[PDB]
Design a protein around this ligand. Structure first.
Ligand SMILES: [Cl-]
Ligand SMILES: [Mg+2]
Ligand SMILES: [Mg+2]
Length: 591
């Protein structure tokens, strides 16, 4: 050994290593900023704008008596110029625009960074035994010192470091050597009492040796080869071999569970849905029972696999709703209600069917049938023109129970929603499989049009009562206004989505309070639907969760627009709908 008072460590590719090549973090930040601001600019246009500004400040700071370097606030101030002149931002000051910027990049770095385990035992040795050595960090970088304080604290290594010196705070670099002149002068260090340790031969050895310090150059040929082949594959707008990679990933999953490969469609839905919610500025989203239980499960996972930590993170809830629970409170007063939504698909029904669809109780059913001398069980060929329907509409007992239970369920459901701590002032944002968005039409009526409702569906084949304030969206496929690209692929045999997206509980029936006044949603326990999930759907739901993670490690933390490869997902989907092999068909009939 010699005898050093200070050990100076380079940061990047010395202490912190990246899963991606270092330039890819500005591309990922570019894609996430393009989603952040309304897709006004593409992921590549914001990235080109960052390049043009970064190399601009380098040349400008160079010939201002400073060194070739830029502070992060200088980049953000210029970005605020282009954004506000091109009308990309609105109601956004410079300070809040900086917050979104620095939080995307801080989460981006956190997602791909990892500390060198060799550096950990090393810095532990330095910070232990007995003789007291101080540990500094000198890095040529653009992020503020407070940002690298955050990263080191998050990695749990800031306890071994005593100072952090970044070229962005004083705009002096290790390359020019002036940053060394500043640290040695301020701290009053004798050069020969410093051991510099880094990966660059110029900035971490040649210049330190010239300044009088002892230096050690560690080898990174194995780490920079990993960056070399990763840059071969991941560019700003493409990933080479992504088609064969997905298709190969789709050949080995097929025997896991029957119809295991719709998980690729669900990943496209989850990834494009998230872009749409963040683009719309959505902070709260509701997943509808019961098909939405597994959809929320995958959406909560996805945000965790993308590294969303402090920005572009969405709170998700679970709204216990069913067609039956949401239709009654949405109706008009009996003087105007025609029940057309119920009569457009069901006509050959019984009074028991009708009184259950408008969600009457068995006591009301056992009183109306008993009072009006009709059979509750008897099914009619045309109920809207039936005698029993004409009897009910005229009966005052019906007319009493109708107004009482329509206004109560409306009051009880609305206070059930208030328990979720969501401000419907900006809008109620809902996600489901759908096809039609029936429940959404009910929800919008329940609030009497005072609440803007936004629907986001896996697929949409029927518009229903779409109108201003009642908006619907088909993420994977839609027929509004026109059929979207590859409509026939995902619409064909679309029943498998309802099968594989079963929930663990019963269907939502009605709303009432518990003991204290808090609203409890009663569910109908259908024993055979419970057995289907427990013994079949639940197992395949968790087997697809694992293949969903592997799709995440290949498609999360990238700069790609997922919509550019919908054809690849349409390809994979068709290979088991246009040719579903052997027993997969018999599994479909069982449930
Ligand atoms: Cl450096
Ligand atoms: Mg370095
Ligand atoms: Mg990692």
């Amino acid at each position: 050994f010699d005898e050093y008072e200070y050990v100076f460590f380079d940061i990047f590719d010395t202490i912190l290593l990246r899963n991606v090549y270092p330039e890819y973090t500005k591309m990922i930040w570019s894609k996430r900023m393009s989603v952040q601001f309304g897709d006004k600019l593409t992921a590549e246009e914001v990235y080109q704008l960052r390049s043009e500004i970064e190399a601009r400040l380098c040349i400008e700071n160079e010939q201002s008596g400073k060194d070739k370097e830029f502070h992060y606030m200088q980049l953000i101030e210029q970005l605020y110029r282009y954004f506000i002149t091109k009308k990309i931002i609105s109601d956004l000051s410079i300070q809040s625009f900086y917050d979104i910027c620095i939080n995307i990049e801080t989460d981006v770095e956190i997602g791909v960074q990892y500390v060198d385990p060799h550096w950990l035992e090393l810095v532990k040795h330095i910070k232990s035994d007995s003789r007291k050595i101080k540990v500094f960090c000198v890095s040529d970088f653009y992020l503020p010192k407070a940002t690298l304080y955050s990263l080191f604290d998050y990695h749990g290594i800031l306890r071994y470091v005593d100072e952090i010196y970044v070229s962005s705070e004083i705009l002096l670099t290790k390359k020019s050597g002036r940053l060394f002149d500043f640290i040695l002068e301020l701290h009053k260090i004798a050069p020969s009492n410093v051991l510099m340790v880094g990966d660059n031969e110029i900035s971490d050895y040649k210049v330190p040796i010239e300044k009088g310090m002892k230096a050690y150059l560690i080898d990174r040929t194995k780490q920079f080869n990993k960056y070399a082949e990763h840059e071969r594959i991941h560019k700003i707008n493409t990933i080479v071999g992504i088609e064969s990679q997905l298709i190969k990933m789709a050949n080995d999953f097929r025997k896991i569970t029957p119809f295991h490969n719709i998980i690729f469609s669900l990943f496209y839905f989850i990834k494009k849905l998230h872009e749409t919610l963040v683009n719309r500025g959505v902070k709260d989203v509701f997943f509808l029972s019961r098909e939405g239980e597994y959809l929320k499960k995958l959406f909560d996972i996805y945000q965790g696999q993308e590294g969303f930590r402090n920005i572009q993170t969405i709170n998700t809830h679970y709204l216990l709703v069913s067609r039956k629970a949401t239709y009654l409170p949405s109706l008009k007063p009996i003087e105007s209600e025609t029940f057309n939504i119920l009569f457009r698909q069901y006509r050959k029904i019984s009074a028991y069917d009708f009184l259950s669809s408008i969600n009457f109780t068995s006591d009301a059913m056992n009183l109306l049938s008993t009072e009006l001398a009709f059979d509750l069980q008897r099914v009619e060929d045309d109920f809207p023109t039936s005698s029993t329907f004409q009897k009910l509409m005229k009966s005052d007992t019906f007319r009493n129970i109708y107004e009482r239970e329509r206004n109560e369920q409306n009051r009880l459901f609305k206070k059930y929603v208030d328990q979720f701590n969501v401000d419907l002032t900006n809008g109620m944002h809902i996600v489901d499989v759908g096809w039609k968005g029936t429940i959404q039409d009910n929800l919008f009526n329940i609030y009497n049009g005072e609440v803007s409702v936004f629907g986001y569906y896996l697929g949409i084949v029927a518009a229903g009562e779409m109108r201003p304030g009642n908006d619907k969206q088909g993420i994977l496929f839609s027929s509004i206004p026109v059929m979207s690209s590859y409509f026939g692929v995902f619409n064909e045999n679309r029943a498998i989505y309802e099968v594989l997206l079963g929930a663990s509980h019963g269907s939502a029936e009605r709303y009432n309070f518990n003991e204290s006044g808090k609203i409890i949603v009663e569910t109908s326990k259908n024993q055979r639907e419970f057995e289907i999930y427990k013994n079949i759907v639940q197992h395949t739901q968790q087997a697809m969760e694992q293949s969903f993670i592997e799709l995440c490690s290949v498609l999360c933390k990238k700069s790609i627009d997922i919509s550019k490869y919908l054809e690849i997902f349409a390809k994979i989907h068709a290979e088991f709908i246009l040719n579903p092999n052997k027993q997969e068909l018999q599994f479909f009939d069982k449930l």
